[PDB]
Design a protein around this ligand. Structure first.
Ligand SMILES: *[C@@H](O)[C@H](C[C@@H]1CCNC1=O)NC(=O)[C@H](Cc1ccccc1)NC(=O)OCc1ccccc1
Length: 181
């Protein structure tokens, strides 16, 4: 097996989880220790369904930028015995573009799903469903409902979380290492 496949599959095994909130099915990224991230609009509550069980959420932080603008990410601290394999080193210090990225999705409906989204480019400002949002990036692929939280990956890097799409193109909230410090 080659390297990109090995990395993506290992993400699925160790870091990318099927979840369900009152808002539906999402892909969750576990980053390190008991810390994971979801799209804000998933609206995680006091508990969350993760894979085969109900998991209590100890803390939720909805990230905003310096001007108070939505970043569309919620950091959740889980009440679990597992420490996620720490993937912070794979997350760039700054929001970074990529060539020929793969969107990795893991939901009950879309389990272990790999989607070649192509190049990922800087986008910045996006108004999504009436919520102005910052630090987004864009790919020319027609992403669909059910794919939010999907992990944007390229060449051993983990660069965004899928948050929306307009039927022709898809958008992620960009990841930076400091979010998870
Ligand atoms: C995952 O929840 C979902 C994925 C979308 C649906 C169709 N294709 C996709 O990739 N995301 C949404 O439906 C978001 C939800 C949202 C996000 C932030 C605040 C509130 C709600 N909404 C969305 O994608 O609207 C369509 C859109 C997106 C970007 C520009 C124009 C229109």
């Amino acid at each position: 097996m080659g390297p990109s496949l090995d990395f993506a599959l290992s993400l699925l095994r160790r870091n990318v989880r099927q979840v369900q909130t009152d808002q539906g099915h999402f892909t969750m990224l576990g980053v390190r220790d008991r810390l994971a991230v979801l799209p804000r609009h998933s609206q995680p509550g006091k508990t969350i369904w993760i894979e085969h069980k109900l998991v209590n959420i100890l803390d939720a932080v909805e990230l905003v930028d310096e001007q108070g603008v939505n970043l569309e990410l919620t950091l959740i601290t889980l009440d679990t015995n597992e420490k996620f394999r720490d993937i912070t080193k794979f997350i760039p210090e700054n929001i970074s573009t990529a060539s020929d990225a793969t969107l990795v999705i893991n939901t009950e409906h879309m389990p272990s799903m790999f989607v070649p989204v192509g190049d990922v480019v800087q986008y910045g400002f996006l108004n999504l469903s009436g919520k102005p949002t910052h630090r987004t990036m864009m790919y020319n692929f027609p992403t669909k409902a059910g794919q939010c939280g999907g992990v944007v990956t390229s060449v051993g890097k983990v660069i965004g979380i899928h948050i929306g799409g307009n039927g022709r193109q898809g958008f992620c909230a960009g990841l930076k290492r400091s979010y998870f410090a």
